[PDB]
Structure 1
Amino acid sequence: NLSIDGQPLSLPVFAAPADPAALLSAAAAASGGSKPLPSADIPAMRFP
């Protein structure tokens, strides 16, 4: 479909470029169980 100079009579095949991808990273809340209470024993000092 060329002209006499070999130039194309058609409009060229266009291609719209891809959009830039949005970056995304992993986000996690920290996980952790509580610590149990230590054992008991009666002291030598009174309560006050």
Structure 2
Amino acid sequence: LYLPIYATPADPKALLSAAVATSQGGGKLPESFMSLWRFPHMLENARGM
């Protein structure tokens, strides 16, 4: 005589994704070297480089 209760499933969860970052240290300068070129020429050189 008793009709059982019709328990019913809930909605699916929203899948979630994690987005993390990466970090890497600052750079370091080389040692400067003195050279025989007057500044305008060594500047045209470096600018090309």
What TM-score, normalized to structure 2? 0.54
- Give the aligned partner of residue 46 of structure 2: none
Structure 2's unaligned 5+ residue stretches are 41-49
Partner amino acid, structure 2, of 1:10: Y
Q: Which has the larger radius of gyration?
A: 1
- If each structure's helix is expressed as a fraction of its own residues, which one has the higher value? 2
What TM-score, normalized to structure 1? 0.55
Identity, in percent, stands at 55
Runs of 4+ in 1 over 4 A off after TM superposition: none
Root-mean-square deviation (Å): 1.7
- Give the aligned partner of residue 41 of structure 1: 33
Higher relative contact order at CA 8 Å, sep ≥6: structure 1 or structure 2? 1
How many residues align? The count is 40
